[PDB]
Each structure stands twice: as C-alpha cells, then as structure tokens.
C-alpha cells in the first residue's frame, strides 16, 4: 500500500528531540518517517537586529518534498510576531518547528509539547486550518495554549486527513 512520507530535517537541534519525533510521528500519521542528515540552520535566515531566525526563510530553504519538516533549537519568528513555534505551507510540502520556546524542566512535558507542535504543523501541510474543537489544530501562540490542547486530531480533522 501507499503511505504518507515525512522527512525530518534537523537544523541546529539536539538528536534527542529528533528521535522523539521519529518515534512518534509514524503512528500518528500512518507515515514512513525518514530522518535526514543533520545540518546547521542557515545563517542567511538570521536577523541580526532581532537575534532570531526567520521561519519563512528556513521553510523556503527546505526541499519541496511532501512532507518535509525542519526542526531547529534556535528561536524563530515570522513577520509581525515576537516569536513563533513554527510555520507551514498550508496544503503544500514544507514546515518548520522550533523547540526553543517549548523548553521546560519537565522532561515529559517537553516531549509532549514537541510532538504537539510537530503534529500541528504537519496538519497544516496536509491542508488543515485552525480548529475550534478540543484538537491539536487549535491555534497556539503560548506554551500554556499548547499544554491545554490535546495531541490528537478531533474527529473532524481526522476525517479531513484520512478522506
Ligand atoms: Zn497553526
Ligand atoms: Zn480539529
């Protein structure tokens, strides 16, 4: 049979974080998941004034192969935002996640946050808009938001992925 493909591109991030995603995403998306060789997040995307990397810039440096998720440990932002957790091509091929704003001394919680945000961004790539249900596709702009939504897709979003 056929399966969705997810390529994880490590971009200046620890290997542990990558492995959390490698081991969680296959079952969530019924996907063949591939971890690409690590590289440094591009200096071309560094904004010297903000001292942050731009998410749109990083995303657009990835190869446009559905679905490729860049994962970085560096703080990222996007136009008009103090920071973002990530960015995605809605219905496209590419997304990026930063774990910088997700860090926490609660190691189990950190893992949960990383999976939630990866799942959310990949959901956007698959064409899902933000959702008002108890759903991972709820908008998140703070970690409290992330902690208070579940990791699972609601029945409406799950349907849109599957059919
Ligand atoms: Zn979103
Ligand atoms: Zn939903």
Author numbering: -3 to -1, 1 to 160
The publication says:
Archaemetzincins are metalloproteases occurring in archaea and some mammalia. They are distinct from all the other metzincins by their extended active site consensus sequence HEXXHXXGXXHCX4CXMX17CXXC featuring four conserved cysteine residues. The overall structure of AfAmzA resembles those of other metzincins, consisting of an upper N-terminal domain (NTD) and a lower helical C-terminal domain (CTD) with respect to the active site helix α2, which harbors two of the three zinc-binding histidines (H117EIGH121) and the catalytic base Glu118. On the other hand, as the homologous archaemetzincins from Methanopyrus kandleri (MkAmzA) and Methanocorpusculum labreanum (MlAmzA), AfAmzA exhibits a second zinc-binding site located in the CTD immediately below the catalytic zinc binding site and close to the eponymous, structurally important Met-turn.
The 6xHis-tag was removed by thrombin yielding the full-length protein with three additional residues preceding the start methionine (referred to as NHis-AfAmzA.). The first three amino acids of the NHis-AfAmzA construct employed in this study are the remainder of the N-terminal 6xHis-tag after thrombin cleavage and will be denoted by negative residue numbers, thus as Gly-3, Ser-2 and His-1. By the bidentate coordination of the (deprotonated) amino terminus and the carbonyl oxygen of Gly-3* the zinc-bound water is displaced from its spatial position between the zinc ion and the catalytic base. Furthermore, the metal-ligand interactions are similar to those observed in crystal structures of metzincins complexed with cognate proteinaceous inhibitors such as serralysins or MMPs. Contrary to substrates, the artificial N-terminal overhang is positioned in a parallel manner to the edge strand ß4 and does not form backbone-backbone interactions with this substrate-fixing element. The crystal structures of NHis-AfAmzA and nat-AfAmzA show rather large differences in the substrate-binding site. Despite different space groups and solvent contents, the conformations of the molecules in the new crystal forms are very similar to each other but at the same time they are substantially different from the original tetragonal form (NHis-AfAmzA) with respect to their active-site binding clefts.
